[PDB]
Amino acid sequence: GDVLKDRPQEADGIDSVIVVDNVPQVGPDRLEKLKNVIHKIFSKFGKITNDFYPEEDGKTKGYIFLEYASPAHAVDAVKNADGYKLDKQHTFRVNLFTDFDKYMTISDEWDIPEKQPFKDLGNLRYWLEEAECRDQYSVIFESGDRTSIFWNDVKDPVSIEERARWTETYVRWSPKGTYLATFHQRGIALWGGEKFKQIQRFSHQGVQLIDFSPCERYLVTFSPLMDTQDDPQAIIIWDILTGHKKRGFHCESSAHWPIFKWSHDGKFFARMTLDTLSIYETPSMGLLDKKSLKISGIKDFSWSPGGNIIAFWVPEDKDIPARVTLMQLPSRQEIRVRNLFNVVDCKLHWQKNGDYLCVKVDRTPKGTQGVVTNFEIFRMREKQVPVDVVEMKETIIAFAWEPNGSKFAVLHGEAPRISVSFYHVKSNGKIELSKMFDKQQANTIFWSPQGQFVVLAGLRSMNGALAFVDTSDCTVMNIAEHYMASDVEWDPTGRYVVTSVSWWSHKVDNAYWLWTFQGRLLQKNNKDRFCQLLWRPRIFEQKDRLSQSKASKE
C-alpha cells in the first residue's frame, strides 16, 4: 500500500508488484549493495518505478517489494526463470505473491491396459489347454462369405468361429501367432488378444499384401493397384508399438512375392533396386550406416537362418560374368564369392539352420540353351566355407532340402513327363544320387518338418497328383487326389499335411484336403470360392487314451 506503516502483501498479489522472500538482512552498507545487484538481475522484469523496504512493526525485513513501469515484462521474467539464486540460503520464489490457501495432497492413480503379448500367451497356453486331440490351428478364407477359425480335432476339423466378411481381401499370421493381420477397406487392422479384437489400425487402402517383421514389431503393407491413401507410395511400413507410418516406399513390379525380405532375427530389412541393394535397420528403419550396398544387376537374394548372412546372385553382363556372393552383416563384407560363368538362371536354396547354401545353376553353351543344370553347395559350419561340387544333369526344374538335415530331392523336366532323382549323404561325405523312380506329374517338392516324409506334388494339374515318399531309402507310401491342386503346407512338427485349391488360382473344384503322416487320408472339405488356408506358426499316450476313453465311455 501507500501507507508508511505497511505490512507484507498477504495473499495473491495484485497487478504490478513482485514480492520476494529470504532477502539479505539489514545492516551497514548491505542495503545499497542489495539495490545495486537488484538493478542488474531484475532489469528484465521491467524498469523499476518503486522499490519498497518497510519494516513490519519495526522488525528486520525478510522481504522486499518491487514495482515496474510496464509490469507485463515481469510476467515474461517469472516465465523466463524461477528459483533465482544468490549465496547460501538466498534462493528466490518469484511471484506477485503466494495463493497459500490450498493443500497439495490428493491427485491419485492409474489403471494399466492389456498388451500385444496377450495372444502370444494364447498360443502356447491354447496348445496345451484344449481338450482335443491333437493338432494345428487355422486361418481359413472360405466358409462362405466369412473368415474363419478351425482346429484339427481329427474326428473332423471343427470350426471354432466363422465371422461374416471379416477380411475383405487377404489374411496373414504374425510370426509367433501374436497377431492376425486382417484387411478392411477403411484400413488394415491388427487383431490380437484371447477373443480377437482390434489393437491397432493402419490407414492405407488398395492393399493385397500385409506381412510382418520376424520379431513382430513392424508391419509391411503393399498395394499393387493405387488408391488415395498410398499417395503415391505403394509399400507402407507401420510401427506396431507407436501405431504410426514409419516409412513409405514407391512400387515394385518385379516380380514374385516376397520382393522385400527380412533378416531371420528381424534386425535388417532389404529390397533390390537393380543397380543398388538398400538396407534398412530395426528399430528406426532408416538407411544402414547412412550407406547402401552397391551391386549391379542383382536378380534375387535369400537370407541365412544363421547370424547374419545374405546370399545374393548377379547375372551376366557385357563386362563382368555371373556370380553368387555370400555377404556377412553387420560387417558388410563379401566373405565367399564365386563367379559361375555363362548361366541361364540360378536358384538360391538355404538349409533350415543355415548350415548349407545350395545353388542350383543352369549353364549355357554358345547356342543359348539350358544344356546342363549343376548343383554347387556351400558348407557353412566347416572351416573357411568349403564347396561341395555335385551334379551335372539335364533340365532340373525343382530342388528341395531335408528339414534340419542334409538329404535332398530333385526333379527333371522334358522326359516327356517329369523324372525324379533322390540324394543321400555318403559314408565318406559328399551328397550323391542313390535312388530314382519312373516319370510322373510332380512339379513341386515339399518336405515334412519331421524329416522322413517328402511330398511330390503335381500343382496346377487337374488330376492326380499328390505322391508321398518315406526317406532314407526312398519308399513310396501313397498316391492321392487333389482335383486342380494349388496350395500346400505341413504342420511345423510334420504331423499333418494340408493342401488347398484356391479360387484365385483355379475355379474348377475348390477345397481343402487333410492327410495323416502315416499315409492315410483324414478328410476333404469342398468350399465354393475358397481363397486361402494358412496354419498358425509354431508315458503320455496311454494317459491321453485314458482321457479319450472317459469322454465316450461309460
UniProtKB/Swiss-Prot annotation:
Cysteine disulfide partners in this protein: none
Keywords: Acetylation, Cytoplasm, Initiation factor, Phosphoprotein, Protein biosynthesis, Repeat, RNA-binding, WD repeat
GO molecular function: molecular adaptor activity; RNA binding; translation initiation factor activity; translation initiation factor binding
Residue numbers of N6-acetyllysine PTMs: K40, K119, K195
Any one of the GO BP annotations: translational initiation
A GO cellular component annotation in the UniProt record: eukaryotic translation initiation factor 3 complex, eIF3m
Modification after translation (UniProt): Phosphorylated. Phosphorylation is enhanced upon serum stimulation.
PTM sites of type Phosphoserine: S70
Annotated compartments: Cytoplasm; Cytoplasm, Stress granule
Region of interest: Sufficient for interaction with EIF3J: 1-105
Membrane-spanning segments: none
Residues of the RRM domain: 16-99
The record's note on its domains: The RRM domain mediates interaction with EIF3J.
Subunit structure as annotated in this protein's UniProt entry: Component of the eukaryotic translation initiation factor 3 (eIF-3) complex, which is composed of 13 subunits: EIF3A, EIF3B, EIF3C, EIF3D, EIF3E, EIF3F, EIF3G, EIF3H, EIF3I, EIF3J, EIF3K, EIF3L and EIF3M. The eIF-3 complex appears to include 3 stable modules: module A is composed of EIF3A, EIF3B, EIF3G and EIF3I; module B is composed of EIF3F, EIF3H, and EIF3M; and module C is composed of EIF3C, EIF3D, EIF3E, EIF3K and EIF3L. EIF3C of module C binds EIF3B of module A and EIF3H of module B, thereby linking the three modules. EIF3J is a labile subunit that binds to the eIF-3 complex via EIF3B.
The protein, known as: Eukaryotic translation initiation factor 3 subunit B
This protein's encoding gene: EIF3B
Residues of the full protein shown: 170 to 745 of 814
